[PDB]
Design a protein around this nucleic acid. Structure first.
Lengths: 143, 53, 101, 69, 119, 145
RNA sequence: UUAGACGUUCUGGGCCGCACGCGCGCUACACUGACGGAGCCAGCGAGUCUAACCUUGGCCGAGAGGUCUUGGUAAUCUUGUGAAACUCCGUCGUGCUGGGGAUAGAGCAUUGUAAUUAUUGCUCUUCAACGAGGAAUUCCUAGUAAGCGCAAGUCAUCAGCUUGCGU
């Protein structure tokens, strides 16, 4: 009867949308996609070395869908976690900014988010149209 | 004598001091107060800092 | 007429509420639209000194508080009656500022 | 210690012994068989795509399986 | 045979102190990027003027100083400096491999332990 | 259902860069017994050498191991950036070297001996056998060993 | 004591120096776990006019950080402080091992007149003891103990400390 991404489970939508972005093959993943730790609190690079970048692009687009607008500073606080600094206690550490900025620029070039008044980036005309189509397919997976 | 007071005092405990007794130990500079710990406790009532809970 | 705003700030509840009451009482003595007193959240300013001079004894701590109460009233009035109502209600302990527009 | 590569003498031991296992799981394989733990977590997938054991709950930290029939 | 970071020792002396810093580490690069009004000329004038004392024979006269926080540059190579440890000036001849180091690294400020064993 | 039945090509402990690499653990963490590679250097060199990371070390036929040791001994030619490198603008050359298995203990020995013969303060602390960085000694660091 | 000063001020150094004993603590000894993605939830507060405080957003950079701007003298902006433990999916698989991260090497930055006796942050490398701790001994009765982070004080820079706050 008409569905949005708010009626889809988050993990099951992000996995399904990340596969769709890779199947299209047009996202311009950076050349540094296999070197980077993605945070200074992390220890090791992402394990899924081929498609970890498509999962950030899917996760960020849903996040912009659910919010009004965000910028690369709000994404670094979101995707960062506690850092083990050895003998001293844990603390929150923001994530890597270059990755989030490249994700947002890739999404603008595919034309799914757009630059916004009041700063940040809002979701676009085609953004709502395209997020909701994969949102429709994810409900009807169960045979 | 051009070297008399020539060392810079722009940060740290040497620059700031109490405005009542000119000490450097136990200074309170919250809300721009600039009064030592012991001096503030004797005249917190006059400033308007009462002790409720 | 002109759009005005009167902001009140004090550390005394009893001395502030009656001043705002005089403001609104003069506001409907000669009637005009109120946008009456919107009380902002009270600010508690805490200073936590230790207790003492020199550190002998049990490590006992004090906390001192100053409470800042703030209220603003958004009035509109002719230019004449602005000055008199801003000058009559002047009381010690209460800081009044008036924003022109 | 624990074998990490199938050697076709462990493989037939998989097929003819897990139907006898009424409770079968990752720690069940590594105790009664001598298997590598990460090989067990692959085996419980392989024993599902063709039905020899059936899932009753699949949690990422705990898999619970019974014999299919 | 001696080179600092790929440039030879005879390339070091025929090279200004600005070009040396351009291949130095980050602490040396940062200090002389904000090193305006550091007063470097008073000490360095007494070093070249002490090299004229010895024509070809043994090491020049010591130039004693208090600046422990001064980075060794190639123009200092061959000089001898008395570095104040806090009470006493210690003569140390500036070997070519001392580049990029502070003068306080070569004048210890404490006599170490000698725990027990009065002998 | 990732079951594979390879039986013959598996290998036990094997030598790379004069070090016995355990053959039946995952390749990225198997390489880390070499003194000079770690969990993040070895991951990148496996990615650059194009190795399926899910393989044990008893896999990896000899041309793949030859590719891997080519990456380790010459990283900058295979697009590894210079900030992974263990030595950068090192002390004499100004080149970029990643120090490897037997060279790690020797290049460290070279550096300690280099700053010992200059009688820098770090060298004297190293020769005495004390904590060379600026850390307290009155209560910790006992049992010199 | 008071002018060769015990006044004051300036350059350096020390308070941090280590055969060793003690007190408060932090991190641990792992599978009720580590790592990687994904979910995403607070409360107490602080913040700059003749001075550079809290900083959104864009751009650059692996990161730390840089740069161009912006909002805020504040229930208005930072800030919904999108905190951490936690939750889901996967990799590991009983091996001092992918637990632990001491010690040490090389580089890049930031604060500062100045960083050597590492201020601190980051990147790669190095991979120590520790396998649940003897006699002893501390604190605690319900939104408490314990786990978990956050703000403020000190501050230019430095929090393994404290004062509070919530989960």
């Amino acid at each position: 009867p008409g569905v949005s991404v708010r009626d889809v489970a988050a993990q099951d939508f992000i996995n399904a949308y990340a596969s769709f972005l890779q199947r299209q093959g047009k996202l311009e993943v950076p050349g540094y996609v296999d070197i980077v730790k993605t945070s200074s609190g992390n220890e090791m690079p992402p394990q899924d070395a081929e498609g970890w970048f498509y999962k950030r692009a899917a996760s960020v687009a849903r996040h912009i869908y659910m919010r009004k607008q965000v910028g690369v500073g709000k994404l670094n606080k979101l995707y960062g976690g506690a850092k083990s600094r050895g003998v001293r206690p844990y603390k929150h550490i923001d994530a890597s900014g270059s990755i989030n900025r490249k994700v947002l620029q890739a999404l603008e070039k595919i034309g799914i988010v757009e630059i916004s008044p009041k700063g940040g980036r809002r979701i676009s005309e085609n953004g709502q149209r395209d997020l909701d189509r994969i949102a429709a397919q994810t409900l009807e997976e169960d045979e | 004598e051009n070297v008399w007071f020539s060392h810079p005092r722009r940060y740290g405990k040497g620059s700031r001091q109490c405005r009542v007794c000119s000490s450097h130990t136990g200074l309170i500079r919250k809300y721009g107060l600039n009064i030592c710990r012991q001096c503030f406790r004797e005249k917190a009532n006059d400033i308007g800092f009462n002790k409720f809970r | 007429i002109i759009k005005i705003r009167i902001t009140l700030t004090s550390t005394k509840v009893k001395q502030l509420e009656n001043v705002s009451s005089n403001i609104v009482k003069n506001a409907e003595q000669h009637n005009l639209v109120k946008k009456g007193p919107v009380r902002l959240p009270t600010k508690v300013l805490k200073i936590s000194t230790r207790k003492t001079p020199n550190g002998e004894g049990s490590k006992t701590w004090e906390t001192y508080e100053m409470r800042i109460h703030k209220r603003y009233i958004d009035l509109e009035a002719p230019v004449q009656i602005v000055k008199r109502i801003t000058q009559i209600t002047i009381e010690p302990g209460v800081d009044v500022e008036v924003v022109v527009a | 210690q624990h074998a990490v590569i199938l050697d076709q003498e462990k493989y037939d031991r998989i097929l003819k012994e897990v139907p006898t296992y009424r409770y079968v799981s990752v720690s069940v394989l590594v105790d009664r068989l001598k298997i590598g733990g990460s090989l067990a977590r692959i085996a419980l997938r392989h024993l599902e795509k063709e039905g020899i054991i059936k899932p009753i709950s699949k949690h990422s930290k705990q898999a619970i399986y019974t014999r299919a029939t | 045979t001696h080179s600092y970071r790929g440039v030879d020792l005879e390339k070091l002396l025929e090279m200004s102190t600005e070009d040396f810093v351009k291949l130095a580490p980050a602490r040396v690069r940062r200090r002389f990027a904000r090193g305006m009004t550091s007063k470097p000329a008073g000490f360095m004038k007494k070093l070249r003027a002490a090299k004229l004392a010895a024509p070809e024979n043994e090491k020049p006269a010591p130039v004693r100083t208090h600046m422990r926080n001064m980075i060794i540059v190639p123009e200092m190579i061959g000089s001898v400096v008395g570095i104040y440890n806090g009470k006493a000036f210690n003569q140390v001849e500036i070997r070519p491999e001392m580049l990029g180091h502070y003068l306080g690294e070569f004048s210890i400020t404490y006599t170490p332990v000698r725990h027990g064993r009065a002998g | 259902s990732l079951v594979v039945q390879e039986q013959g090509s598996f290998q036990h402990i094997l030598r790379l860069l004069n070090t016995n690499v355990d053959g039946n653990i995952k390749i990225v963490y198997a390489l880390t017994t070499i003194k000079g590679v770690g969990r993040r250097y070895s991951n990148l060199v496996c990615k650059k050498a194009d190795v399926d990371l899910h393989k044990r070390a008893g896999e990896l036929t000899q041309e793949e191991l030859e590719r891997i040791v080519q990456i380790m001994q010459n990283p900058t030619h295979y697009k590894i950036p210079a900030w992974f490198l263990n030595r950068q603008n090192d002390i004499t050359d100004g080149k970029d070297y990643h120090t490897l298995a037997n060279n790690v203990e020797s290049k460290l020995r070279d550096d300690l001996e280099r700053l010992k013969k200059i009688r820098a303060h770090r060298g004297i602390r190293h020769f005495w056998g004390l904590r060379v960085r600026g850390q307290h000694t009155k209560t910790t660091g006992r049992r010199r060993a």
